[model samples]
Target: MADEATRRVVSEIPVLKTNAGPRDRELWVQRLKEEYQSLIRYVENNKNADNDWFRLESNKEGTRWFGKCWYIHDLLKYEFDIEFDIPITYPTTAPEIAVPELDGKTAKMYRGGKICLTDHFKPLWARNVPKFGLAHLMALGLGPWLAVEIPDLIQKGVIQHKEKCNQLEHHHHHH
Candidate 1:
């Protein structure tokens, strides 16, 4: 959350309403609009500056989120699928980012593909509790993992470091 680049990204993400989760509390619909717009900006966030880092789409009720996040590795797109649902605890507990595609491939990007925990990741997460959102988690949490982990796996050949960025949906193949 320190570096000026991510700080700018952190700044662009608008603060979400204080309503809990989208369990129909009268503002969940409005909450979805906020999530949509907030995430859209992060993707459109810096077209010239960064050319998109993530894209999230959710089902009605705005509970479960589906997204495709990518990081640049020498002009080759390192992308993967990420999923998470709004916890009933909402911001108080923070949502878990699960890279279903990366399951069993590594450690906490590991814990059921939930991208579980890191020393500082949770320290700040717990500290920033009730202020975080799906967008915020992806920003401060998943974004770091994307930047830190993909290349590690690439070096291990767990995933290929390809030159193509247009990723076709691979969710329904055999799982």
Candidate 2:
């Protein structure tokens, strides 16, 4: 069960009804439009609550998405890059969100780092279809995963804590 905060976050974003796939251009536009709107509003809402934890964007066609999300444990922030694809058969097929860099650190996910959201996620999405779009996945899926798993990872000495200075560097060390 999602904690009160998680469900509260989900409550504000109205459920969607656009059942279009990536191939359905105009209809997909409507789907994509509200996806951004709901997400944008969600971000705004998070900011207002001083709980903003993620930021995201998608390809021009709005299929491939990538973002950064974070969680806090013991006042330290741990963040990761997130990625997923909006399936061509979306609305029926849920996006399998991933945190590629965290792939091998845990068994709660698939081979390529797709989060193991099957338990409640599949059943809920299967029940709600078009209403549970990508944002709902963010709320119900990744949001809760981070809240739960991050603490477990921290306690098990899996992930470390940091608030480092931002930098960009190129690496060509691999051969």
Candidate 3:
């Protein structure tokens, strides 16, 4: 009997063959495995991340960053709940983050999301930004910078996310 992951791969074989080259196929398969494991860990640990939202690890690989967002809604209590179309590239290229609605409540994130680096962009690109996986960019670059500028809010949000996650987990378990 095929396992869920294997079953999913089998189902996607045709699309995989049509849309992806051999290299793409190999990379995507590897990425899918990593993402699946990461998501499982995230689900188990950080239950409060989001509800009815999707997490996607980009197929660009090596130089690409993972993305997450909660769909925008009118609720005030939610954390910066604006739809995101953010893309972060590795090495020299800066991350691109955009949000359509940024009036009163959401102006704080007006740039949507910002990526800053201490090093010169031109010099960094002279030598390719070696692919160091999603961990490096997020943990070292974005995460640390975010910590300094908005430590309290970040901490609060993480706590709220976990609480929300636990609530959802309980609700699902009961139902």
Candidate 4:
């Protein structure tokens, strides 16, 4: 059974049947619902205007999700699209977030454009279980990736002002 917030978000994005089996799909649906609401709250309260720009959607199978988070730095707005799939062993494992457009631009990213959630973020997510979701991944993982890397990328002339990246690439990895 879904809660009020879960019901609201789930209404916007339908959870499709997946290969992960019924139990995992149910957990995934609930987690996604929580994440959607959490993301909304973060956007509303966060001082950064860029935090407000985001979109999330699931594939037909619902095993994978596609998302885009936009932010501005140095008066330039940059968009990063991310993709992550649910593992059959989810709740025991966390989804790895990836930004395909930013791949090869920084070493902080993994081979498949997976953003490296270092130090505390990794352990924190592992410990938090179902309590953490895509929202936390965005707030902690992508948030830091942009804040730290984007500035450097801009400074090094790797990314120019007002850049818009709408490309969606497929990259999947198992933990």
Where in model 3 is the C-alpha error above 4 Å?
Answer: 1-23, 42-78, 81-113, 118-131, 151-175
Which is the winner by lDDT between candidate 3 and candidate 4? 4
Model 4 spans with C-alpha error above 4 angstroms: 1-22, 46-51, 162-175
Listed per candidate, the RMSD to the true structure in angstroms reads 6.7, 7.2, 12.3, 11.1
Which tens-of-lDDT digit does each residue in 1-175 have in candidate 3? 6447533522332211121212455654564455345444533433453533334454444323345634322221223322222233322243443323222222244343443333543454345344332322333343333434344443445324323345544531332
Q: Using lDDT as the measure, which candidate wins?
A: 2
lDDT of 1 by residue, 1-175 (tens): 4589777768889877654566766777766777677777777755657666766787866778787877766656677877777777776676666777777776545466666545688788777666556677777876676667666577777786543534464322233
Clashing pairs in 3: 47-165, 48-161, 48-162
Off by over 4 Å in 1: 107-109, 162-175
Estimate the overall C-alpha local distance difference test score of candidate 4. Answer: 0.59
Which has the better lDDT: candidate 1, or candidate 4? 1
Q: Which ten residues in a row have the lowest lDDT in candidate 1?
A: 165-174
Enumerate residue pairs that collide in model 2. none
| Stretches > 4 Å off in candidate 2 | 1-6, 162-175
**Highest TM-score, which number?**
2
Full-model lDDT for every candidate? 0.69, 0.73, 0.37, 0.59
In terms of TM-score, how similar is model 3 to the real structure?
Answer: 0.35
lDDT of 4 by residue, 22-128 (tens): 25556556555655566666666543533456777777555677878777554346777778776766545666666777777766565666766667767766665
The weakest ten consecutive residues by lDDT in model 4 span 13-22
lDDT of 1 at 4: 92
- Clash number for every model? 1, 0, 3, 0
